[PDB]
Structures are given as C-alpha cells and as structure tokens.
C-alpha cells in the first residue's frame, strides 16, 4: 500500500542520518574488550576443579 | 540484502509471447529453488511455476501447462519465464519467489501475502 | 525338552558301560 | 505515487550502502590476523538434566548462575538446580505448545509463551509455597517466540505477528509496540544496560530498538534466510545472529554493518541458538545437525565442537559468570558443558 | 543299574556262608562261581538254569539254557561254552557301542560349542544393551531378560554336564549327591525359564500389534512374572514330586510321568508361541498388501519372507518341528536338531537383535566416533 | 547444609512422582494436528467432533484424542508447523469441490519438510457431495485419466463423479508416493462434513500408524 511506502521511506530517512565510525576503530575496540577480559573467561582457560562447581 | 527484480511484461495481444526475467542479488542463486507466482486483479496470489536448484525438476500449474516454460541461469544469477499463446485470464502481476531456506525440497509460504523473499512484480496485460 | 532326553540317554548308556567294564574285568 | 515512493526508497538504500562502504576502511579479519588463536577448546558434559517428556525449546539461566528454567512441549516448565541436578519447581502449563521461557533477573518470576499467543508470568515466591499464574499478557496476534524480563514489572516479547511488545506486568497492558519487521520475529536480545534491544525476524534482517521511544534505530542486513537467533556482545556495542543459511554473522552498532561471517563448507544446516562467552572471545552456536560449534569470535575459526546431543539443538545459554554453558535439545535432555 | 553288583555280592556272601557244611560232597563241591552259584549235589546230578539277569542286561536274546555239573569252576560244565559266560558281551556289537560313543560325544561337543558361543556372544550383547541408557526401553528390557534366560540356560547345562558326567563316572549311580540333584533342578528351571521367555517375546509382540493401544508399561511386571515365577513354580512342584516319589540317583532318568511336570508346560508354551507367531504373520501380511497393484516391489512376499526368517529365532518356532514327537520315536534326529543346531539359537538372536539392530549400531558408531 | 540438601532431595522426589504420573497420562494420549483452509470444511468437522490455538478432546473406545486447530495465526506457517513434528498424525482437510492446486502445494510442502518427516498424514477429501453435484481446463491430464481398477465406488454413484474423485485422490497420492520411503504414510479418505464416520476413520488410521511404528521398531517393516 501507499502508507507502507511512506512509512518505509521515513524509516530509511531516519536511519540514513546516523553517524558511523570506521570499521577499523570498532574492530580495535572489540579486540581490546576481548583482551581485557580474557583472564575472567572460564571457558577460554580451563578452570581447576577446586573452584569449578560442576565437578 | 535479498533483492529480486522482475523485468518484462506489459501490453500484448491475445495469443502473443513474451519473456519475463528476474535478477537476484544478495544470496547464492544456485542454492535456492525458485518459483513464479501471480496475482490477478481482485484475486489472491496463485502459484504458477516452479524450478529446482539445478533446473532438473520443473513443475507448472495445470492452467498454464503446455504454454509457459521456466528456466534459470545460475552463472548470471537470474531466471526466466517464457509465456507463449497467452489468454485473457493470464493478465496479472507476476512475482518471483525464492524458497525461504536452501537445500530444501519443500517451499513454504511463497504464495502467502507479505512474503519477504518475493519481488515487486511486473504487470502483464492482454 | 531334548536336553533332558539326551541327559537320560547319556546316563543310561554310561551306567551300562560301567557295568559292562566291571563284568569284563571280573570275567 | 507508489513508483516514486519506491524509487526514493531504493535511492535511500543506495545512499546507506554507499555510506557503509565508505566507512569500511578495514576488515576485522585482517586486523585480528596477528593475534594468537584460542587453540582447541575441549568442553565436556558435567550434568545431564532428565525429566522432560517431549522436545525442549527454551532455557534461561538465572542471574545466580545456578538455577535455570526449561520449557518443553509436554506442557512443563522445570526449574533445575544445575549444581545438584535436583528439580526445584515443576509448573504445568495451560497450553502445551510453549516456544520460549524467561527467568526474571531477581529470580522471583518466570515467563513462558507460545502458540496460545499469551505471555504467562508465574510467581515463584508465593506465600502459600506453590507456583501459580501471576499474570497473563494478551494482545499479540501471533505465536510468542521470545520473551525477556527488563525488571520485575516490565517485560519485552517477540511474536509471530511481525511485531515486538513492551508490557507492564502490573497493569497487564502493552505499553509499547515495535513495528517494522515484515516477517515472524523469531529471536530477541536485551542489551546489558537494558536500554536497547535487538530483534531478529524471518525477513533476513535484524533491527535495533530503543526502549524509551519505541522506534527502530538501525537495521542490519546480510543474512540470506530467516534469522533464528540473536545475542549481544558482552560489550554491548555489537551482536551476533544465526540464520537458516547455515551462517552466523557479527554485526556492529557503531559501524552499522557486518564485520565477520562464521560458516564452513560442510555446514549446510541452520542455526537455532547463539551465545557469547563472558569475555566475548568465543561464539557458541547450536545447529540442526545435532551439534554445537564454538567459533573464535575474533578470527572466525572453528575452535571446538559440542557433540553430545542426539536430536536437534534448540537452545543454549551461557551463565552470567561464564562458568558453564547449558544446551537444550529436542531429545528432551539438557546438558551442561565446561 | 549298579544294584546288580550289590545282589551279586549278596549271593556270594550267602553261598560262602552256606559253604560251612562239613559234608564231603563227592563230585559236586560247594563253592560260589564268579557269576553264579550251585548247591552241593551228589555225583551224577546235573541241572539246567538260565543266564544271570545281569548278563540279561546286555544280551539281545535271553532265556538260554545253561548246564550245571560237578566241576571245580566253569570248564564248560558249570556254564557250557564261553558264549553263556559272555551272554551280553557276545550278543552286543562293539560297533553299535562304538557308534553310540561317537554319537553321544559328537552331540555333546556340538551343543557344548553352541552353548559356549551363545553365552559368550550374549554376555557382551547384554552388556551393550544395558550400559547404553539411550537403548533403555520396554522392548530392550524384555530382550535383556531373554538374553539372561539364554545365559542361565547355557550355564545350567554346563554345570549339569560337570556335575553329572565329568565327575562321578560310576559312583553317581551308587549314591545320589545333593549337589547333583541341585544341579539337575537348576538345569530344569533354566531350560523352562528360557522357553517361557521365548513365549513372553511372542506375547509381548502380539500384544503390541493386535491390541490397539495397550500401554504395555503397566503390565511389565506381569511379563516378568510369567517369564520367571511360573518356571520356578513348576520346578518346585517337580522337585517335590521327585523327592516324594522318585528319589532315585541324580533325578536324571525319565521313568514315570513326573517328567511331564517339566515336559508338559514347556510344550504348551511352544504351541502357544506358534499360534502367536502365525497371528503376527497375518498382521504383517495386512501391512504389505495395502500398497496397490502399481507398487509391488517385484513381490509382496519378499519383505514378508525376510521378516518371518528373522522372527523365527526370536520366538523359537523351530521347536514346533519336533514338539509332538514322542521321546522314544526317532530320538537321535530330534536330539541332533534341537541340541547341535538349537544351542546356537541364542547366539543367532544375540546378533539379529543386538549387533544388526539399527539403533544399537548407530549408538555404537556414535560412541566410537566420540571416543576416537 | 545436609538438612538443606535433604529438603531438595524430598522436593525432587515429589516432583518426580508427579512427573511419573504426568508421563503415564501423556503416553496414553494421541495428539493430532488439524490442518485445512477456512472454506475446506475444517470448522464444521471440528463442530461435529464435539484464541491462538483451539482444543478438542474426544474419547474413542476408551482411547483419548487431543486434537489441535491452527487458530489465530498468520498464513506464514514456516516456523510454527515444526512444533507439530511429533504429533501422531496430521489431518489435512482438502475441499475437493484454483484452491485445489494450493492445497496440493501445501501438502507437498508438509510431506517434504525435513522436520515433518516420520509424521503421517490423514487426508480428508471433504465436500464430496459438492464435487458430485458440480476440471479439464484446470487439470489437462484429467483428459487422459481412467478410473483405477481398485476403485470401490459407492452404489448409485455416477462414473464421472468416481473418476473425478479418484483423479483428485491420485493427484494427492503421487506426491506421497514420490518420496514416501516408508518413514511416514498417507491415508486418504473420501469424506463429507457431516459424516459420523470421520471419527472412526481417524481412530483406525491412528491404530494403523501405531502398528506400523511398532513394526518399524522391530525392523519387521
């Protein structure tokens, strides 16, 4: 219908006015977050059975 | 994103012939089974033709069997429907529908209204 | 069952052999 | 006219694509190529939860990382104590066609819903000591596919009527409606700050919604088929989607585009559930081939395989503290892995 | 029949006691012959008697006349000719006895090998069926009991063979040990339990097919009862009857009708099983015929024949072949068929429903892939 | 915390007793998914047998049946249909009176679905009287169709009506026999909306499905 077309056009106009950062910076941020929490990830590094509740 | 664009159609005298084309983008064409459907004025969507991934399995509805032929070019990522010897009740908006999932024999909801993997459609009038 | 029949036949045959060997040794 | 509306829409989409291409200076793969791989990941099954009669669709870990809830087609919500394997509560459902379940962050409430188009909220802390229907939220015209608590009084639900809803539990009214999807909204994920949420539908697109104004902020495309699962990155600036095209994809809120694709040549089955590890380095995805795959989220490498289930893996979730991951399958069993 | 030696010794003692007379006994003295006895008679007195009953045991023809005369011992007068001295030895053919030894041994080693192979295969079959929790179902439980019944039957046969023939070559007839009778009772119970579990397999499959929706789980205990307790009841009744009426030897001989306490029910079970088998076949025939004339698979009976062939060992239908044969009518063929070939039945079962089963093979290969 | 763990053990024991009772109830009940168009006669069949999903309970020969109706759902049946992958049967109602082609396509999609495999379909070719009182243009191959030799027409039936109904039945059965493989079976029936034999037909088909499943478990079939 026509009203759906106006709604889609308005949504596209709203979405096209956002600010986008470079992909390199975002990838660097994601990598930094992954590296800053590696020690706190029990799945990455196997945890000894002393403090493993499922054992 | 998934984009199906249909070209061709228009005004043609009864008994004429024309070749509708549809170009697909945003997905691997060779992995999906394709359909041609149509909507007549004042009527719901109706399945017309069906072609498999490799084109070996081809089916048509009984109304257009023997007059319509369907084909696909995977290299060009497109498909064609050649219609010969048209009739007055063939006037409709023709849509190209993609099967929702790849590597599946079944094809659900291609003729259902508000289907995501369907083109805008092209008008064919006698 | 056939198992019991075979067991009975084997026992009777063994009993006859034991008496026969005994008789042959005595006679 | 409809034609000029369509051409305006397509030129706007072309402009958006051009902007995204301009912002795509480098690839995440060629940035993380220089980091050490996580190596082989060998998770093992520690607990096997038995008691469900039929196939299981949804599970949700509690915030204590000990109690969880599971939903099965026999009409049962079951609360499991994962540490001792004991069953805490067994809630029979009025409708046996449940497709989703949620655990309140406070732990005082549980939620379920499905083909009945009703979101049932059960109170687990009744004075009498038995679980009873605390509330029933109605208004959706399609099946409930996902529900998530914001707090004890607010919930967000995704339905098959191509819309999402934000409900106030106290009044039982649909406070906010999120529209824009053209397909069955299948998966829902809340941001860590609970201010935005991502919805994945059957239109091969994901949408980011703001809770306050109830408007779509961004739309992400790239999947070829229906999106069945969605989950934020632990940072909250990115999310991951699994689709029926046998691929997972990592989308970024700030970059407004896809960064990484996780797929393999020998994988031709759709993804039913995805989740991240505590640090976000590992991406766990449940597949239709009865197996789960753990991918290196930074290098798109298949780190490990969880192959303990005999039927389709329907759901999986990672504890808040990240100690273990629980997978529920259609074989009526839950398995905890670490 | 060791009582022959007992009464021979009794006769020897009696003649030795009677030999205390001080009479001269001219011609015919008084002394007990190694096989017979003869009272003191005057000179010229000769009599006619018959060959001893002991020698009548091995002689084809009895009642021969033997002379008794005045000699020290034998000398063709106390017994004229070596032939009366060897009434049974001469009549019998070493050949028939040698051929009998070959039969009783070939049959023994044949069913020993069959039972050993069946036990070895069924042990691992039961271990596989019981360790994997995925295979746990009522069908498999009824099959585990069938495999335990077969194992118990084989073990009881081995124990009976060791207790009866391996030890006690001649003393078993003289004295009946308590352990011998216990082994015989255990053997009878195990055989009857195996037969009744073959019947339970037929009953379980017929109830699953013919009955619309039986929900067989609620009568699993009934299947266990009919499988185990009824053979125990009949075995106890047979033991009581043997104790009170026929407490002879090791209870390993069939003389009276007490054998029908054991042979009776088992036969009936076999008959019942056969009937059930036929019924099941009919039901199966109702599931291959519904396909129309267009769909034939080149025959509607090729699938039927394979299913019938693989159902034959699961119930023990072959037992109907010689079920009605009397014990004294052609025993050798029945024993050969039901022991040399029958003892492998469990082994065959241990394949056809454990190693060739689709679910078991799938789980085994999945576990092997996970381990590898 | 032995007392705390003891409480958990006793609560788990109570829950498992309740679950055992619920399992006994659940395994004795047969679930059927009723699929059909709005004008196919499904609603009147539901009424004779007596918002998101509708329920019908009916007992036949002391056997419980637990039948479901689609209810208030969109025509997009791609996702929720999987929820019925483990039902005893799918009763597919088709109006024999081009809606027939749409019904055929829907039946093909149901039959060839990877999750709907092993699920049997009971085909109710409804509105037989309307077809009798009422094909060549919509189905050209009907020009060369002959009544099968195995047909069993009801007495007093016009041969043309028998030919048409058996042509429709064979058109539906072609899809089922194309990719049957014995994992699931199709049961066609010529029914009417007000027929009282539909319940018996469903019961007999469920009996046959259960028997075939049991035979498949024993690899006899």
JSON list of N, CA and C in Angstrom, two decimals, chain E residues 85 237 280 282 306:
[
{"chain": "E", "resi": 85, "resn": "UNK", "atom": "N", "xyz": [29.05, -117.72, 29.16]},
{"chain": "E", "resi": 85, "resn": "UNK", "atom": "CA", "xyz": [29.89, -116.93, 30.07]},
{"chain": "E", "resi": 85, "resn": "UNK", "atom": "C", "xyz": [29.84, -115.46, 29.69]},
{"chain": "E", "resi": 237, "resn": "UNK", "atom": "N", "xyz": [7.44, -77.82, 42.03]},
{"chain": "E", "resi": 237, "resn": "UNK", "atom": "CA", "xyz": [6.50, -78.94, 42.04]},
{"chain": "E", "resi": 237, "resn": "UNK", "atom": "C", "xyz": [7.19, -80.22, 41.59]},
{"chain": "E", "resi": 280, "resn": "UNK", "atom": "N", "xyz": [0.87, -63.04, 14.29]},
{"chain": "E", "resi": 280, "resn": "UNK", "atom": "CA", "xyz": [1.70, -61.89, 13.96]},
{"chain": "E", "resi": 280, "resn": "UNK", "atom": "C", "xyz": [1.95, -61.84, 12.47]},
{"chain": "E", "resi": 282, "resn": "UNK", "atom": "N", "xyz": [0.06, -62.88, 10.11]},
{"chain": "E", "resi": 282, "resn": "UNK", "atom": "CA", "xyz": [-1.15, -62.37, 9.48]},
{"chain": "E", "resi": 282, "resn": "UNK", "atom": "C", "xyz": [-1.20, -60.85, 9.58]},
{"chain": "E", "resi": 306, "resn": "UNK", "atom": "N", "xyz": [11.66, -62.29, 4.62]},
{"chain": "E", "resi": 306, "resn": "UNK", "atom": "CA", "xyz": [12.79, -61.87, 5.44]},
{"chain": "E", "resi": 306, "resn": "UNK", "atom": "C", "xyz": [12.38, -61.63, 6.89]}
]
